[PDB]
C-alpha cells in the first residue's frame, strides 16, 4: 500500500524562525533527512486525519536565504508551501511578496499559507491590520509562535484540505510536539485572535 505525502517548501527571510518551526515536530525532527547537494534538511511530518495518515515533507533551508534567492532544485515539485515572516521585523513582511513571486514562478498555482511567527513576544511591530498580502489570491494566514507551539497545526490542516479537497478533513490527534520553551499568554492570544477577525470583516 502506497502512502499519502506532499512536498512542502518552507520559505521566508532568514531569522524568521523557519527552522525553529519545522523542528517542533519530534518525529519529523528525528527522521529528517539531508540533501547535501542542495543544502536542505527534509522533515517528514505525519499528521493523523480522520481520513488517515498524511505526510508533509517539509524542506528546510541550511540558511542560504540570507545571501540571496533559492535554486529551482529547491522549489521543484513543491505541492504546497508556507511563507513565513517575523512579526517583530517589518522588513521580513515587506519581503513576503518577493518570496511569493520566486515561488509561483516555479510552482504555478499551489496552495500557500502565510505565517506570522514570534507572536509570543510582547512588543509586536506588524499588527493584524498591517497584514494584507493574503487578502489577494489563495493565501490563508495564521499568527504562529514556534516556541510555544501556538497554532502549529493550523497551516497544515488548511493545506491538507486543499490538497485532498476535503473541507471536512480533521486531525484526530495533535502530533507529538517539543515542550513550549516560552509561554503564550492567553491574553495576547485572545487580543491577537480578535484583532484578526475585526480585520477580515472590515477593509
Amino acid at each position: 500500500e502506497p502512502q499519502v505525502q506532499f512536498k512542502l517548501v518552507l520559505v521566508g527571510d532568514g531569522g524568521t524562525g523557519k527552522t525553529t518551526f519545522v523542528k517542533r515536530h519530534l518525529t519529523g525532527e528525528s527522521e529528517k533527512k539531508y540533501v547535501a547537494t542542495l543544502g536542505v534538511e527534509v522533515h517528514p511530518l505525519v499528521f493523523h486525519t480522520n481520513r488517515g495518515p498524511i505526510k508533509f515533507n517539509v524542506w528546510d533551508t541550511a540558511g542560504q536565504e540570507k545571501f540571496g534567492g533559492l535554486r529551482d532544485g529547491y522549489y521543484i515539485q513543491a505541492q504546497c508551501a508556507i511563507i513565513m515572516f517575523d512579526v517583530t521585523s517589518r522588513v521580513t513582511y515587506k519581503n513576503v511578496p518577493n518570496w511569493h513571486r520566486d515561488l509561483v514562478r516555479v510552482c504555478e498555482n499551489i496552495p500557500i499559507v502565510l505565517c506570522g511567527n514570534k507572536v509570543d513576544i510582547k512588543d509586536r511591530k506588524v499588527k493584524a491590520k498591517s497584514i494584507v498580502f493574503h487578502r489577494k489570491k489563495n493565501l490563508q494566514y495564521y499568527d504562529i509562535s514556534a516556541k510555544s507551539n501556538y497554532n502549529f497545526e493550523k497551516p497544515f490542516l488548511w493545506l491538507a484540505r486543499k490538497l485532498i479537497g476535503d473541507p471536512n478533513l480533521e486531525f484526530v490527534a495533535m502530533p507529538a510536539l517539543a515542550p513550549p520553551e516560552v509561554v503564550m499568554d492567553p491574553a495576547l492570544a485572545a487580543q491577537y485572535e480578535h484583532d484578526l477577525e475585526v480585520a477580515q470583516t472590515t477593509a
Binding site: K33, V35, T37, L38, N57, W59, G73, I76, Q77
Partner: peptide, 26 residues
C-alpha cells in the same frame, strides 16, 4: 511512482534519478 530515499520526493518510472536534487535511483 517510486520515492527517493534522500529527500522523499515522488519521482516517475521514466525518471532514473531525482528531478529535484539529481540523486540516483537505487
Amino acid at each position: 511512482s517510486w520515492q527517493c530515499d534522500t529527500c522523499l520526493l515522488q519521482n516517475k518510472v521514466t525518471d532514473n534519478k531525482c528531478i529535484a536534487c539529481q540523486a540516483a535511483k537505487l
